[PDB]
Amino acid sequence: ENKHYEVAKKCVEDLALYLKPSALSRPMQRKLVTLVNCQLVEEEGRVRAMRAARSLGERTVTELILQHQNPQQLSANLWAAVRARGCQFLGPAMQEEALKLVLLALEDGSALSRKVLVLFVVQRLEPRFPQASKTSIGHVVQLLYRASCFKVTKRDEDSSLMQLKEEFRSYEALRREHDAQIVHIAMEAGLRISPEQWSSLLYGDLAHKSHMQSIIDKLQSPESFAKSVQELTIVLQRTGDPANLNRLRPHLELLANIDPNPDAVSPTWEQLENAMVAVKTVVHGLVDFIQNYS
């Protein structure tokens, strides 16, 4: 006898059919299960469902953006940005040894002109890595300078001398500020990159997600659902949108306007119905788009 409840329940059952008693990613599975378990005859269940739907929606936007993202074009863009600010990243093994060699020189509180510091490193990097040039090592040093690792002392008729600050005289402290500056460069160039891409880019493995997450939390605020939809819009403007993903926009906007905060007003049946319809439409879209286009 309740049209709204029937459409809504109908929408949820339909989405349940994506669950194997692997059409979706595991995140989507987790979040879908949450919505499906919601009891729409109770208020605490209608509320929890509005929250679930927003989550599914925000995630859908994310996977769509990720689908358009080429990691080979993305990394070239990272290093271009780095080089455009005078710095370099020589690749996981090489940077490691170089930062260590910097550390080795200045740990004790030694003070060396930039030129003297570069030579020190390059000399000791020769055996394991002969492609090292005074210019490349220079840029690694400029990287550390940009991250404000050095205390520097002016002199007349002779070179300025550089010391590491007390607080960076360890590889943990040094690598952390180093890694942070390369993120800060990513942000300046307008590149959202994920702890897993980062871990892969700087160390060459998936084992530094946690370390990297900690920095991004410190340097960046997470992007609202709203700003993500705007992000996808632009991509779609640039591609021309042959799958008509832009048809999902009304629905994503509806979902993003759901107030997730816990002081929020419970939904009306209408609002609930519209939300379930919206999330159904969006999720179906994601699946169809992945199944039909690369």
Author numbering: 91 to 111, 124 to 396
Recite the paper's sentences.
Roquins are a family of RNA-binding proteins critically involved in maintaining peripheral immunological tolerance and preventing autoimmune diseases. The human genome encodes two Roquin paralogs, RC3H1 and RC3H2.
The structure of the RNA-binding region has an elongated shape consisting of 13 α-helices and one β-hairpin. The first three and the last three helices form a tightly packed unit that has little contact with the ROQ domain. This six-helix bundle was found to resemble an HEPN (higher eukaryotes and prokaryotes nucleotide-binding) domain based on a structural homologue search of RC3H1 using DALI9. Analysis using the Rapido algorithm confirmed that this region is composed of two rigid body moieties, which correspond to the HEPN and ROQ domains defined above. The two domains are connected through two flexible, proline-containing (Pro173 and Pro324) linkers and no buried interface exists between them. It is unlikely that this difference is caused by the RING domain in the RC3H1 structure because the RING domain has a large contact area of 863 Å2 with the N-terminal helices of the HEPN domain, but makes no contact with the ROQ domain. However, neither our apo-RC3H2 structure nor the RC3H2/RNA complex structure contains a similar protein-protein interface in the crystal packing.
